[PDB]
mmCIF file of N, CA and C in Angstrom:
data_model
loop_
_atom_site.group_PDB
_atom_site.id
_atom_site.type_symbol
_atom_site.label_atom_id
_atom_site.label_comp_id
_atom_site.label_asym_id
_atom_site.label_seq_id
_atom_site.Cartn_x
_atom_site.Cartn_y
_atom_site.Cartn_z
ATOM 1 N N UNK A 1 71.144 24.250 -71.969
ATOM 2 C CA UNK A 1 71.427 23.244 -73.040
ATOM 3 C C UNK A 1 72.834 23.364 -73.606
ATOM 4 N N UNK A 2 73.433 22.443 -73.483
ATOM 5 C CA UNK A 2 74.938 22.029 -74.422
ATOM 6 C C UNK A 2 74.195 22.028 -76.190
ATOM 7 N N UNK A 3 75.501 22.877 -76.497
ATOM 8 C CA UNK A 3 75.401 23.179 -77.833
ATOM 9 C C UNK A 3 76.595 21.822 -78.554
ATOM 10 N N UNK A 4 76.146 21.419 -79.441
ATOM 11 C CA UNK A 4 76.850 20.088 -79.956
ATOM 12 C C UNK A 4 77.175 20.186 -81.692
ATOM 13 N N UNK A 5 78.105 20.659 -81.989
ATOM 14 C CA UNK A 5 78.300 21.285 -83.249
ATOM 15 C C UNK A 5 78.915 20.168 -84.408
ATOM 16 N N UNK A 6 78.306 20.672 -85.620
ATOM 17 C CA UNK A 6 78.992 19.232 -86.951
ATOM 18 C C UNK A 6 78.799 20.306 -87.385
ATOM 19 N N UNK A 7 80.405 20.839 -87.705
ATOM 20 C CA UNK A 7 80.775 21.414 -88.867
ATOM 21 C C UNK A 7 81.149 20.774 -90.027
ATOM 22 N N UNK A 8 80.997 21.160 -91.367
ATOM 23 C CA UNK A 8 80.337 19.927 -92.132
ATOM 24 C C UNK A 8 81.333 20.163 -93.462
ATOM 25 N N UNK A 9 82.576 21.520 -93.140
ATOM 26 C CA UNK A 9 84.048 21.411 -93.774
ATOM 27 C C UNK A 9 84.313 20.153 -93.499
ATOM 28 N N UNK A 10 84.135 19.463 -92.481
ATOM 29 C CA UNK A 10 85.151 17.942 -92.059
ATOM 30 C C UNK A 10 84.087 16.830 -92.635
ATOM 31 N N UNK A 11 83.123 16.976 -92.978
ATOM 32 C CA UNK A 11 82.137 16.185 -93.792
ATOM 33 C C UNK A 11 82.417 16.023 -95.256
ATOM 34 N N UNK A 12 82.776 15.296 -96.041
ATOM 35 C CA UNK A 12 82.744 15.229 -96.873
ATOM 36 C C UNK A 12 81.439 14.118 -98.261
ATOM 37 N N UNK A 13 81.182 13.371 -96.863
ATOM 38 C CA UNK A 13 79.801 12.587 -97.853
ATOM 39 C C UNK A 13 78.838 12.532 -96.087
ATOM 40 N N UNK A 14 77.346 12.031 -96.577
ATOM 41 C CA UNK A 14 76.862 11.788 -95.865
ATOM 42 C C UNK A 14 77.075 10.306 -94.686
ATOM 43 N N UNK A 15 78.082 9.878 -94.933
ATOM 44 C CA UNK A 15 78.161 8.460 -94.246
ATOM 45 C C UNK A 15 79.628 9.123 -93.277
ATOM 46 N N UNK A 16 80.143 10.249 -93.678
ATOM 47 C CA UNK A 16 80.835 10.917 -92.968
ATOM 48 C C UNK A 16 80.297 11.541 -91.534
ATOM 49 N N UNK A 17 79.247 11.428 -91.890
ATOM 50 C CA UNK A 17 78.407 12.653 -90.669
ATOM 51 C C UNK A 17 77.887 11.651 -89.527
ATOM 52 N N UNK A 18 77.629 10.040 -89.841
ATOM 53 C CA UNK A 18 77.250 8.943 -88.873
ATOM 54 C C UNK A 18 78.694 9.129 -88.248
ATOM 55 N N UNK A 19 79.811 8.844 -88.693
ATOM 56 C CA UNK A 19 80.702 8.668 -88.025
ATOM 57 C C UNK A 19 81.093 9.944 -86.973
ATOM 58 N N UNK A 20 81.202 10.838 -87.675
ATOM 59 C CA UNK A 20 81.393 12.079 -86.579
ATOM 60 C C UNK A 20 80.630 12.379 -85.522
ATOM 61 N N UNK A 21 79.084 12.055 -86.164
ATOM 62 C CA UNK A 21 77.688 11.625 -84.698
ATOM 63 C C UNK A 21 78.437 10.676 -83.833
ATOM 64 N N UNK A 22 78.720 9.346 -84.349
ATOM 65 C CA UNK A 22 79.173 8.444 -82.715
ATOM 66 C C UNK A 22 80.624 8.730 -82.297
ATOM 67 N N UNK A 23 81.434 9.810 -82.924
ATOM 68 C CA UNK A 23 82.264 10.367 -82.117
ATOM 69 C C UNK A 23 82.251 11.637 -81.487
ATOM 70 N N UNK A 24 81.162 12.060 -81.536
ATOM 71 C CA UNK A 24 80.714 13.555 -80.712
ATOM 72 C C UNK A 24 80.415 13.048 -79.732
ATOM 73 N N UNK A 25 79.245 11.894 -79.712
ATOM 74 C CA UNK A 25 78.258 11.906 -79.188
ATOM 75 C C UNK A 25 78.995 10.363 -78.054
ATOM 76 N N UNK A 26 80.113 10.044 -78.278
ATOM 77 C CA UNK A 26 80.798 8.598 -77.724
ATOM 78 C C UNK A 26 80.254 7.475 -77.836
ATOM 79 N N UNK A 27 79.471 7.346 -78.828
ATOM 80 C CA UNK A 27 79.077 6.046 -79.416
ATOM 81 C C UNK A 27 79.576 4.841 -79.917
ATOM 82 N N UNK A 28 79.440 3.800 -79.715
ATOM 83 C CA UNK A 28 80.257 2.953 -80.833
ATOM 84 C C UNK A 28 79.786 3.057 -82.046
ATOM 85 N N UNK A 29 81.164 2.923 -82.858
ATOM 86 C CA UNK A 29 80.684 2.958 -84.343
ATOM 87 C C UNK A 29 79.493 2.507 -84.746
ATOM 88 N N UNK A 30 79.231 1.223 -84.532
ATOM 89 C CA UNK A 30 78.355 0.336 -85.057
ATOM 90 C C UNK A 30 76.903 0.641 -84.612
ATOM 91 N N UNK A 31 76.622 2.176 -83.539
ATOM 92 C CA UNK A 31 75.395 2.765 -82.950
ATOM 93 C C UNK A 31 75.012 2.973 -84.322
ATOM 94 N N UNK A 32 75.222 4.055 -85.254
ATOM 95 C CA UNK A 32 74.538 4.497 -86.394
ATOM 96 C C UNK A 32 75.520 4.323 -87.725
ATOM 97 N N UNK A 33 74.793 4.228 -88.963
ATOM 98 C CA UNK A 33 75.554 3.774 -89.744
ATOM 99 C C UNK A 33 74.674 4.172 -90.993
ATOM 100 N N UNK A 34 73.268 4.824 -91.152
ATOM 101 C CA UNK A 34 71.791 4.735 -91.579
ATOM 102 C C UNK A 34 71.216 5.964 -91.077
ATOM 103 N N UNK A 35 70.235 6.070 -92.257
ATOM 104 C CA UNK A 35 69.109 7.031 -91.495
ATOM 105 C C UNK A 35 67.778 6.362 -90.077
ATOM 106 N N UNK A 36 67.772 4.976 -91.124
ATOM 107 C CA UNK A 36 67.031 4.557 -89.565
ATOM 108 C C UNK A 36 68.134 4.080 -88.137
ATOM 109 N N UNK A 37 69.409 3.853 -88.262
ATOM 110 C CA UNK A 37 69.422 4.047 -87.385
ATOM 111 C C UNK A 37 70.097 5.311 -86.410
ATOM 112 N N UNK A 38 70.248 6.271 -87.183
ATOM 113 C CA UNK A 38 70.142 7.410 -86.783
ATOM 114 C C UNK A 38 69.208 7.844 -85.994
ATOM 115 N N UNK A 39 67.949 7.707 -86.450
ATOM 116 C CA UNK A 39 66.644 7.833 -85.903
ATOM 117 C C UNK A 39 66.762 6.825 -84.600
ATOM 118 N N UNK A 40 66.988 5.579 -84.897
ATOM 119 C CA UNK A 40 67.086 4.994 -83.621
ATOM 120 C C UNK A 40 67.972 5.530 -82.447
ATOM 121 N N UNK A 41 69.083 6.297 -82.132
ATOM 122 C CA UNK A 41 69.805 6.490 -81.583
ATOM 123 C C UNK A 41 68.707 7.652 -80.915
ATOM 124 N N UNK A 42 68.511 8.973 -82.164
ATOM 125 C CA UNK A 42 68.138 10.281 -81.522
ATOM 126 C C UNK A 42 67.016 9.822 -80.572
ATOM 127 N N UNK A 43 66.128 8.281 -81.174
ATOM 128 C CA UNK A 43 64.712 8.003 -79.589
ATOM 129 C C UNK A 43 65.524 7.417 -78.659
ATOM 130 N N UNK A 44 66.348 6.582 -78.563
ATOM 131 C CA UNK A 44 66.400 6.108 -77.638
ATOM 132 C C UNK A 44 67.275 6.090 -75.975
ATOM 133 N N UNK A 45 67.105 7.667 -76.473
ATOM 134 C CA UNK A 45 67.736 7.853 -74.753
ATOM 135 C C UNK A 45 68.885 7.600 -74.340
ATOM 136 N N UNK A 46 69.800 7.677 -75.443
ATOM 137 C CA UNK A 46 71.184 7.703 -75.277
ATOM 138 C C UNK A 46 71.954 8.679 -75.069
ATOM 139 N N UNK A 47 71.503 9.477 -75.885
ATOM 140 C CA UNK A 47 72.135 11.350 -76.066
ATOM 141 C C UNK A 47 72.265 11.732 -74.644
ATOM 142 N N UNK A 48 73.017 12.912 -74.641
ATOM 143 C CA UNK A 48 72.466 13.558 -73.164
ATOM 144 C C UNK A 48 71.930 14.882 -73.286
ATOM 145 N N UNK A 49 70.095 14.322 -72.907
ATOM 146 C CA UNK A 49 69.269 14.753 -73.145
ATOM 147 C C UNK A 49 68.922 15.658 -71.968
ATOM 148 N N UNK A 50 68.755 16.796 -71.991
ATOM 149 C CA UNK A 50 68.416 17.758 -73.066
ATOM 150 C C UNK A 50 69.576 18.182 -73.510
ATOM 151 N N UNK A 51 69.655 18.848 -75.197
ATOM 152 C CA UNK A 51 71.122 19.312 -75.825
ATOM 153 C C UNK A 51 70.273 19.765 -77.388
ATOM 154 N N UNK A 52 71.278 20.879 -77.671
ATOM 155 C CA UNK A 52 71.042 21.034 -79.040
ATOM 156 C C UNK A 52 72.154 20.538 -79.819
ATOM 157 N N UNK A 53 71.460 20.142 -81.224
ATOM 158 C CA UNK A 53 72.413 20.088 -82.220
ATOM 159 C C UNK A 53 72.547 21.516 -82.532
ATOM 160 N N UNK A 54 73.703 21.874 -83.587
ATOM 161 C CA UNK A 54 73.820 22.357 -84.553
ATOM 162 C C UNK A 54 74.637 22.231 -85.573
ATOM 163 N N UNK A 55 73.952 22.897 -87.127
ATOM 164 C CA UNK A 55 74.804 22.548 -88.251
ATOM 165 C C UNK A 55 75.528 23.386 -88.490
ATOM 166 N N UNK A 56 76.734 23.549 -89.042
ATOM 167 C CA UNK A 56 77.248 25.165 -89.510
ATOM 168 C C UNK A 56 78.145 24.736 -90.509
ATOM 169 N N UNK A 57 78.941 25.582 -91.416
ATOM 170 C CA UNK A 57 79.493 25.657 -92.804
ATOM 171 C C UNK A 57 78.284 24.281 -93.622
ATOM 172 N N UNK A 58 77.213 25.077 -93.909
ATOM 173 C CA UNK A 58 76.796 24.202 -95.130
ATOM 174 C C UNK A 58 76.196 25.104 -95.779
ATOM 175 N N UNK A 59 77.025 25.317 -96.958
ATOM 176 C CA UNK A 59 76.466 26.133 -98.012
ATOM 177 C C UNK A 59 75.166 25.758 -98.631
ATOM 178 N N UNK A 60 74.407 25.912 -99.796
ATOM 179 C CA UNK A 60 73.539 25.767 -100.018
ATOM 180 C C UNK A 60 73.470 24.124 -100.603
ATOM 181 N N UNK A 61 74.190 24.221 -101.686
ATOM 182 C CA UNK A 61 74.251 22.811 -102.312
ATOM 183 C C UNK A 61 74.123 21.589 -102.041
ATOM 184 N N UNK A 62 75.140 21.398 -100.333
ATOM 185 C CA UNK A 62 75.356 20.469 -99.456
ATOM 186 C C UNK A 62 74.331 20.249 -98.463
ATOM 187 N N UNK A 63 73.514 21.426 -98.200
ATOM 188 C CA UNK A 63 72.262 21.776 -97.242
ATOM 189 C C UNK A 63 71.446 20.541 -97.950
ATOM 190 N N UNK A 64 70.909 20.613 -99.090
ATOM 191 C CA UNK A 64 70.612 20.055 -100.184
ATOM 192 C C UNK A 64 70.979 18.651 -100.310
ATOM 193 N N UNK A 65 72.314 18.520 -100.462
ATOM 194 C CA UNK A 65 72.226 17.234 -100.767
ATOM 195 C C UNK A 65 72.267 16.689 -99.608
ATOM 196 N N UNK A 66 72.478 17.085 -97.932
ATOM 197 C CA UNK A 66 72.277 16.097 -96.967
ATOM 198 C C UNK A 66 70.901 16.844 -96.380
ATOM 199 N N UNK A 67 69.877 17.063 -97.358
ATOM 200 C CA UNK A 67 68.912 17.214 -96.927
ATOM 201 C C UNK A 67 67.746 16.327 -95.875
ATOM 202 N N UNK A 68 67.770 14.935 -96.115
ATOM 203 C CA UNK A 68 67.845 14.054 -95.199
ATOM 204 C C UNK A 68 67.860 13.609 -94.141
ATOM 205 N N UNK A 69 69.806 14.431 -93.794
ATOM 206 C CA UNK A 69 69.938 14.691 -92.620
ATOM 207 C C UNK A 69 68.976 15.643 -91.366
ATOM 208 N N UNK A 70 68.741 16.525 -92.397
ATOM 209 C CA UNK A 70 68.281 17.806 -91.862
ATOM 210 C C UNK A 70 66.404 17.911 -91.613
ATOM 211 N N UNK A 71 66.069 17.123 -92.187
ATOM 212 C CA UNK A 71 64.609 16.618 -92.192
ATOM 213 C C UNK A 71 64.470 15.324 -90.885
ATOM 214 N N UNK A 72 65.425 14.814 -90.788
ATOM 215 C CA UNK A 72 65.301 13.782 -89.966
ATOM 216 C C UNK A 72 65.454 14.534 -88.434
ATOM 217 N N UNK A 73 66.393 15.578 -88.298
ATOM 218 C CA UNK A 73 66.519 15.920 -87.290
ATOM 219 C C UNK A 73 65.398 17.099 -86.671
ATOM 220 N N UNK A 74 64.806 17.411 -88.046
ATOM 221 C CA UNK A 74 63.707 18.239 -87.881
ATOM 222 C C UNK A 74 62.598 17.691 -87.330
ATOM 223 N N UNK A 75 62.414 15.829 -87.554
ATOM 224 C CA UNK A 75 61.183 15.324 -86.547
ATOM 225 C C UNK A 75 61.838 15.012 -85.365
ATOM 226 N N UNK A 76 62.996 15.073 -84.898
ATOM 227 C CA UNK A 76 63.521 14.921 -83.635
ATOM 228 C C UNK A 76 63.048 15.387 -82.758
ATOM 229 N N UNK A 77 63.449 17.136 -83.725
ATOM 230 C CA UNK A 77 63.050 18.010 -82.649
ATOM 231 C C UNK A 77 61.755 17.899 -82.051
ATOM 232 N N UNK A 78 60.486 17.952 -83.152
ATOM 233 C CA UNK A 78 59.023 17.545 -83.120
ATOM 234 C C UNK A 78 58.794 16.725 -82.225
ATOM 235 N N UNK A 79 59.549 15.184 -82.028
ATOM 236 C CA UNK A 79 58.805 14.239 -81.506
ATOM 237 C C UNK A 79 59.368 14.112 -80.293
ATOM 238 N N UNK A 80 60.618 14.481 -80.136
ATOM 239 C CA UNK A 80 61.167 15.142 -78.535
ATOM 240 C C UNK A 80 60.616 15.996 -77.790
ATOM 241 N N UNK A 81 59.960 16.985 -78.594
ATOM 242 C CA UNK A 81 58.833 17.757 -77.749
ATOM 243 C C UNK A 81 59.415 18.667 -76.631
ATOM 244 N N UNK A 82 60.830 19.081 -77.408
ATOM 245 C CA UNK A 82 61.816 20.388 -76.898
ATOM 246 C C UNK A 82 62.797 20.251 -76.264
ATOM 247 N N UNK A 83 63.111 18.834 -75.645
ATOM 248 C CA UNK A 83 64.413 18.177 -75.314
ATOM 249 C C UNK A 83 65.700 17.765 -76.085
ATOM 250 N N UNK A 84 65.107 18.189 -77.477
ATOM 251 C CA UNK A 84 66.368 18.280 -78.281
ATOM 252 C C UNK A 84 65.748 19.698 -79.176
ATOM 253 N N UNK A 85 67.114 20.075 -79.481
ATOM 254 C CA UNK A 85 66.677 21.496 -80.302
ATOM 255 C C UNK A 85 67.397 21.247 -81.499
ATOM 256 N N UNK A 86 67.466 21.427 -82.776
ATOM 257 C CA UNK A 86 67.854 21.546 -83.731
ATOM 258 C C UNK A 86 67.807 23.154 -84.372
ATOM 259 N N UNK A 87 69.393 23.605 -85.096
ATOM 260 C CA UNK A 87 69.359 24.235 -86.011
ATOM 261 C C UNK A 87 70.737 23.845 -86.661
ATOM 262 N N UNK A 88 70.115 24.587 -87.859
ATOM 263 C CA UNK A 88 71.418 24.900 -89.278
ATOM 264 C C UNK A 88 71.858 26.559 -88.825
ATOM 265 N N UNK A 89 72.972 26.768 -88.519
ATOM 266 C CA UNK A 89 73.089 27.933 -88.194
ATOM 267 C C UNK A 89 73.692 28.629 -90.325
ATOM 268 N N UNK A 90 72.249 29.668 -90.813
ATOM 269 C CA UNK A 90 73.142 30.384 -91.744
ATOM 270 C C UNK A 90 72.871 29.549 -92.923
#
């Protein structure tokens, strides 16, 4: 598995983190923009699947406030059924 990293120093709000997703990931902008369509992207077989995410520099606060993020990717993992892996490293 390719490790696929959002370090989240270069994040500064959550609408920051769609954009850095469709430029990790070579998306067009207009792929995600939302939590649903975030969700839409992680089902639909675009990614290159199998791959892990991971999160790193998120202190506690920010863990928190893009908690969201981190819940959403947590049913990813679930409903992918091990073809995507998720962690917060720390």
């Amino acid at each position: 598995m390719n490790v696929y990293t959002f370090d989240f120093n270069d994040i500064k709000n959550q609408s920051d983190f769609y954009r850095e997703f469709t430029q990790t990931f070579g998306l067009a902008s207009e792929k995600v923009s939302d939590l649903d369509t975030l969700w839409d992207a992680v089902m639909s077989d675009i990614l290159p699947l199998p791959l892990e995410i991971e999160f790193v520099h998120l202190p506690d606060k920010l863990r928190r406030r893009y908690g969201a993020l981190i819940l959403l990717f947590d049913e990813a993992e679930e409903e992918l059924e091990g073809r995507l892996r998720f962690n917060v490293r720390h």
